[PDB]
Amino acid sequence: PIEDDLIFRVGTKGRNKGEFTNLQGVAASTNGKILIADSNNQCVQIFSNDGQFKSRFGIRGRSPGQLQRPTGVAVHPSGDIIIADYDNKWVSIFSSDGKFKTKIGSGKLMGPKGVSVDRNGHIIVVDNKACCVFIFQPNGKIVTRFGSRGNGDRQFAGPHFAAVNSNNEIIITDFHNHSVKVFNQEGEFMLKFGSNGEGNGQFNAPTGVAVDSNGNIIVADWGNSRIQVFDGSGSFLSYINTSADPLYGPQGLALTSDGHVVVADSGNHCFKVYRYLQ
């Protein structure tokens, strides 16, 4: 299979600029940037939407303003960069140039992964290890928390990533329950979708997620390494065609300001950018 929906790929294994060890979170900004968090290189790298390297920041360590196992990444409308740290157990807010401003969740989080910003400016934090989701004020006060460890609708099993749709509904990938779950802005369960398998519309261990302007939910899965698109009611629509250069254990996923889908192809030490809107 010679061609698919891939536009370009960036990255090889390593610790230098444009190289990766463990791609995790992916974010994309309204200023036309792609941001990649690397949990094992302890850095965030910023690229243009066309894949050109722009900048890198991240100081290894366990103190405030350092990164130890950075996972989720989001960009605030302000341009600040929000980074979850699984090992430091807090979420940092950096400037667009990587200056540490504040951290939230310290003493509250067990092991965060996904981070997002809701339509009201709340910071949504997926606590992968605690199997719950927090909604924080920017000052670090908890608005609400939802979920606990388990297999049921209102539980999570290693939740990974988050997205927020135009109705301020929160979308969570529930990795070890093989489903995507949608909540209202109060954190109350609305619906789940997905099934564990290899056939059409099925997946295994959903990871990266995004939601488009029409409410369609774009989901990467770690176990089959595909990207599947669902409508906002959770019904399968289509694949993003990755067959010419397959994924291997994808992590974070984002929609870019130029209408593409970017995915962390972590097992192949690269990010891949796909046609989506055109």
Residue numbers in the entry: 467 to 744
Quoted from the paper:
Tripartite motif (TRIM) proteins constitute one of the largest subfamilies of the RING-type E3 ubiquitin ligases that play a role in diverse processes from homeostasis and immune response to viral restriction. The NHL domain, or so-called NHL repeats named after ncl-1, HT2A and lin-41, forms another protein module found in four TRIMs, including TRIM2, TRIM3, TRIM32 and TRIM71, that constitute the subclass VII. Here, high-resolution crystal structures of the NHL domains of three of the four human TRIM–NHL proteins, namely TRIM2, TRIM3 and TRIM71, are presented. Comparative structural analyses revealed that, despite sharing an evolutionarily conserved six-bladed β-propeller architecture, the low sequence identities resulted in distinct properties of these interaction domains at their putative binding sites for macromolecules.
The NHL domains of TRIM2 and TRIM3 were highly expressed as a fusion protein with an N-terminal His6-GST tag in E. coli. For TRIM2, the structure was refined to a high resolution of 1.45 Å, and the crystals belonged to the monoclinic P21 space group with four molecules in the asymmetric unit. Nonetheless, an exception was noted when comparing TRIM2 and TRIM3 that were most similar with ∼82% sequence identity. In contrast, the rather shallow flat surface of the TRIM2/3 NHLs resembles that of their homologue DmBrat, which has been shown to recognize a linear RNA. However, comparative analyses suggest that similar binding of an RNA observed previously in DmBrat would be unlikely in TRIM2/3 due to the lack of a central channel as well as low sequence conservation within the pockets. TRIM2 NHL has been shown to interact with the motor-protein myosin V, and the function of this E3 ligase has been linked to neuronal activity including neurons and axon growth. In line with this, genetic studies have unveiled a number of mutations in the NHL motifs of TRIMs with a link to diverse pathological outcomes, in particular, diverse neurological disorders. This includes a link of the mutations in TRIM2 NHL to Charcot-Marie-Tooth disease (CMT), congenital bilateral vocal-cord paralysis (BVCP) and axonal neuropathy. A frameshift within blade 2 (K567Rfs7X) undoubtedly leads to a loss of the NHL domain, whereas the other nonsense mutation (R741X) results in the loss of four amino acids at the C terminus on the bottom surface. The other mutations include a substitution, D640A, and a deletion, N594del, both of which are located in the proximity of the central groove on the top surface, thus they could affect directly the integrity of the intermolecular interface.
